[PDB]
């Protein structure tokens, strides 16, 4: 099994699965996506062809997939804004879009291994490997429809409250 290693660490390694890898890689990528979608509480997921996506996985020293990041190409995204408080979690965004390259469609870390910089290293791996001969900046990635955990992560990782978001309608 040829394996595409992006980065190696003392506590595991980050690998990437591309749309034109062998079937065994694409099934493992799918199994991992299924677990993530389920973890997020989806019963059914009907979307475009995964042939657009790239799947990054953080593999522990025990050969377990404990982190997963699915990236897809995007063109534009929107700065997130805090929902104004009511007089007596959600988010909004700006109306003007900004240019962006990489949209993080799903990001997940096994719960017992959270707060160990796994997600941060997966995004790092993406920023260095998504586009040939370029390292994306934090202003060139966006996150789809973030969960509360996603917001807290992205605002720290990107070092701003108004990080880029995508994958929404009106």
């Amino acid at each position: 099994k040829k394996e595409r290693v992006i980065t190696e660490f003392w506590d595991g390694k980050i690998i990437m699965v591309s749309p034109d890898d062998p079937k065994y890689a694409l099934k493992k990528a799918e199994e991992v996506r299924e677990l993530v979608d389920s973890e997020l509480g989806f019963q059914q997921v009907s979307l475009r062809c995964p042939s657009q996506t790239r799947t990054y996985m953080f593999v522990s020293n025990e050969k377990k997939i404990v982190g997963c990041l699915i990236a897809e190409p995007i063109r534009e995204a929107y700065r997130v804004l805090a929902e104004p408080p009511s007089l007596h979690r959600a988010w909004r965004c700006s109306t003007e879009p900004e240019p962006a390259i990489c949209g993080i469609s799903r990001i997940w870390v096994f719960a017992l291994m959270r707060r160990k910089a796994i997600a941060s290293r997966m995004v790092d791996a993406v920023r260095s490997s998504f586009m040939y001969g370029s390292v994306l900046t934090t202003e060139e990635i966006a996150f789809s429809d973030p969960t509360p955990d996603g917001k807290l992560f992205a605002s720290t990782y990107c070092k701003v409250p108004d990080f880029l978001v995508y994958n929404f309608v009106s």
């Binding site: 997020l40 909004r92 789809s144 429809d145 969960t147 994958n167 929404f168 309608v169 009106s170």
Partner: peptide, 6 residues
Amino acid sequence: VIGAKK
């Protein structure tokens, strides 16, 4: 707002 998640 609909959103590809919620």
